[PDB]
Every structure is written in structure tokens, then in C-alpha cells.
Design a protein around this ligand. Structure first.
Ligand SMILES: [Cl-]
Ligand SMILES: [Cl-]
Ligand SMILES: [Cl-]
Ligand SMILES: [Cl-]
Ligand SMILES: [Cl-]
Ligand SMILES: [Cl-]
Ligand SMILES: [Cl-]
Ligand SMILES: [Cl-]
Ligand code: NA
Length: 129
């Protein structure tokens, strides 16, 4: 499913991301825009053989099992295909574990390079929330 900007903002708020670990909603909507263009079915292969999955591009090296990343962990306890669903519940639950791991939202390279330090409130303007 490809989300609209305000539809995804609403769904993230409902699942408790808004100010989660100090990050306002606009930070999460900005990261999803630059990681996947709001498409729950996005995948991308990395040079080490791992793959990133779903609206927040979560990586199979640490976080999920895809049966093809030898010697990796599965810290979220889920198959990576669960992260491609139109229901974002699995992605959001796993993102809360990643952001808690010590490096905050710096875990997402697009957030650090394109959202960090910008006016992120802009991503939720005009939305009914
Ligand atoms: Cl947009
Ligand atoms: Cl915000
Ligand atoms: Cl594996
Ligand atoms: Cl393969
Ligand atoms: Cl593990
Ligand atoms: Cl599996
Ligand atoms: Cl949802
Ligand atoms: Cl932090
Ligand atoms: Na894995």
C-alpha cells in the first residue's frame, strides 16, 4: 500500500510514535518519506548481502529473519516479510526497539541526512490529528 502523508501521520500517532523517546511525529513521517516514499512494499539489497524492508527500511542483519543473511540476528523476532504488510503494526513495534538501542533515529541514514535539523513540523501541517 502507498500511504498519503496525513493518512500515515494518523496511523503513526495511533500506534504511539508521537514523541516516542523524544521524537515528534514529523520526524517519523519525514524518515518514512525518504526511506520508502511511503510504500509498505519497498525493498533494497545492501553490499554485505543484507536487505532493508518496508516503510522504514528495517535491516535483516540485526532485526528480522529473511532466510538469506547468514550469521545475522533477529532482534524483533519476526520474519522480514511481516514488515511489508499494509498494516504497519509490525514495522512500528520493531522501530520502537531500534530507536531505543542507543543511537536514537541516527539508525536511519536518510533521517540523519535529510530530516535531522530541518523544520520537521512541515510534514504534519494541514493534517487533522
Ligand atoms: Cl508528500
Ligand atoms: Cl513534528
Ligand atoms: Cl538468515
Ligand atoms: Cl535469494
Ligand atoms: Cl537474535
Ligand atoms: Cl521466518
Ligand atoms: Cl495501519
Ligand atoms: Cl535520542
Ligand atoms: Na536476520
Amino acid at each position: 500500500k502507498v500511504f498519503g502523508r496525513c493518512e500515515l501521520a494518523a496511523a503513526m500517532k495511533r500506534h504511539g510514535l508521537d514523541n516516542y523517546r523524544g521524537y515528534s511525529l514529523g520526524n517519523w513521517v519525514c524518515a518514512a518519506k525518504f526511506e520508502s516514499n511511503f510504500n509498505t512494499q519497498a525493498t533494497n539489497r545492501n553490499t554485505d548481502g543484507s536487505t532493508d524492508y518496508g516503510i522504514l527500511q528495517i535491516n535483516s542483519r540485526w532485526w528480522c529473519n529473511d532466510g538469506r543473511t547468514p550469521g545475522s540476528r533477529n532482534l524483533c523476532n519476526i520474519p522480514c516479510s511481516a514488515l511489508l504488510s499494509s498494516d504497519i503494526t509490525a514495522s512500528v513495534n520493531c522501530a520502537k526497539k531500534i530507536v531505543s538501542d542507543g543511537n536514537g533515529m541516527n539508525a536511519w541514514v536518510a533521517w540523519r541526512n535529510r530530516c535531522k535539523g530541518t523544520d520537521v513540523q512541515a510534514w504534519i501541517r494541514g493534517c487533522r490529528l
